Amino acid sequence: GSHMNLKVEFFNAGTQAQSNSIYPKFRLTNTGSNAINLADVKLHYYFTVDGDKAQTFWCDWSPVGSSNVTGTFVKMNPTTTGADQYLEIAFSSAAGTLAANTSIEVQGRFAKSDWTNYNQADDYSFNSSATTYTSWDKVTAYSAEGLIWGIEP
Ligand SMILES: [Ca+2]
Ligand code: NI
């Protein structure tokens, strides 16, 4: 009612269909009056891997300190349209809190260990058109309570 006031905006920094990397950019805004503990916040980006390989996420920049933002990859079960895996982004305790009526960006890439290609065009979370942050319900966010933003596939 006031404890999940996290607005999530998103775009893709690189929009090549055949791409050796995926470039998620999130903007998270605390739209409420109470601080949000980022250590409890998770984000998901859903996609089809187009050839499963070990993957790595890098956060290149966030105001909270890029080293405090990490990613792991999970398989969808069962798989569904546009989604056989997701990236899950997490924040460490050193990321701190997100103050009332403030926002932070989280800018990351991910790639396969052998740098082989993805097809972005079929990915559930991919936005082929946005060039700026946009309110996007095809990425999800979570608190300790569970889902707080978006539509899971
Ligand atoms: Ca794909
Ligand atoms: Ni609430």
Angle at Cα 82 formed by Cα 117 and Cα 103, nearest 5°? 85
Q: Which two tokens stand for residue 61?
A: 């920049």
The CA distance from 123 to 12, in Å, is 12
5: which residues sit within 8 A by CB, 6+ positions away? 30, 31, 32, 34, 36
Domain ranges, ordered by start, for the chain: 1-153
Please report, in range form, the residues annotated as the binding site.
Answer: 48, 50, 119, 122-123
Q: How far is the CA of 59 from the centre of ligand 1 (A)?
A: 21
Contact (Cβ atoms closer than 8 angstroms) between residue 153 and residue 82: yes
Method of elucidation: X-ray
3-state DSSP call for residue 31? coil
The CA distance from 29 to 35, in Å, is 11
Is the alpha carbon torsion for 62, 66, 69, 73 positive or negative?
positive
The CA distance from 19 to 29, in Å, is 29
Q: Which residues of 122-139 are buried (b: 16+ CB within 10 A; e: fewer)?
A: ebbbbbeeeeebeebebb
CATH number 2.60.40.710 is the correct assignment for the domain at 1-153: yes
Ligand nearest to the CA of 121: 1
The CA distance from 36 to 19, in Å, is 35
Q: Which two tokens stand for residue 51?
A: 């050839």
Contact (Cβ atoms closer than 8 angstroms) between residue 91 and residue 26: no
Question: What residues does 110 pair with on adjacent strands?
Answer: 22, 57
Q: Which of 26, 10, 9, 6 is nearest to 100 (CA)?
A: 6
